[PDB]
Amino acid sequence: ARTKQTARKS
Amino acid sequence: DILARVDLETTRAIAKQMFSSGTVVEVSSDEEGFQGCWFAAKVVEPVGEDKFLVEYRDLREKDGIEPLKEETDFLHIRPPPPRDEDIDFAVGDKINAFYNDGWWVGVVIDGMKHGTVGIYFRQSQEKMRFGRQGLRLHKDWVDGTWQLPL
């Protein structure tokens, strides 16, 4: 798993 | 983008039928940096007539520990797509790649070699090899049916 912004691009 | 292809009345009814508490789903977002991404989640509970409180399988709150919970509407939730785990990608195929804990839309640019497939992402303009296990054919959920790209 990861946080929502560790998953966000750009 | 959205509604040109789906029917609101139908989509809402089918979401109400299918997405009850405990149901595994995928969810999307229209926030910047998330275009063409589906995240795995599970319905906590329906919210009113239009929305669903979901808990993400992989995404976490800021401490990196507790699962992220968000409300999503009936236009941004779908069932997990059926997956044909054994198929041969062809150059040009629109796929999803499991990347940074989401399923991201990409295009096959090179056929499988050594168990990897060459992929390109328009979102980031990056290309790379992906293990076959983290790839699937892109499918659209439309009015209660799965459809390949037109």
Could you say which of B34, B101, B124 has the minimum Cβ distance to residue A1? B101
Q: How far apart are CA B116 and CA B132, in angstroms?
A: 5
Flag if A3 and B64 touch (Cβ within 8 Å).
yes
Strands A2-3 and B51-60: parallel
Q: Which CATH class is domain B8-78?
A: mainly beta
Could you say which of A4, A8, A10 has the minimum Cβ distance to residue B68? A4
Flag if A7 and B102 touch (Cβ within 8 Å).
yes
Which residues, listed in sequence order, are joined to residue B47 by a DSSP beta bridge?
Answer: B51
For B53-84, b/e burial (b = at least 16 CB within 10 A) is: ebebbbbbeeeeeebbebebebbbbbbebeee
Flag if B34 and A3 touch (Cβ within 8 Å).
no
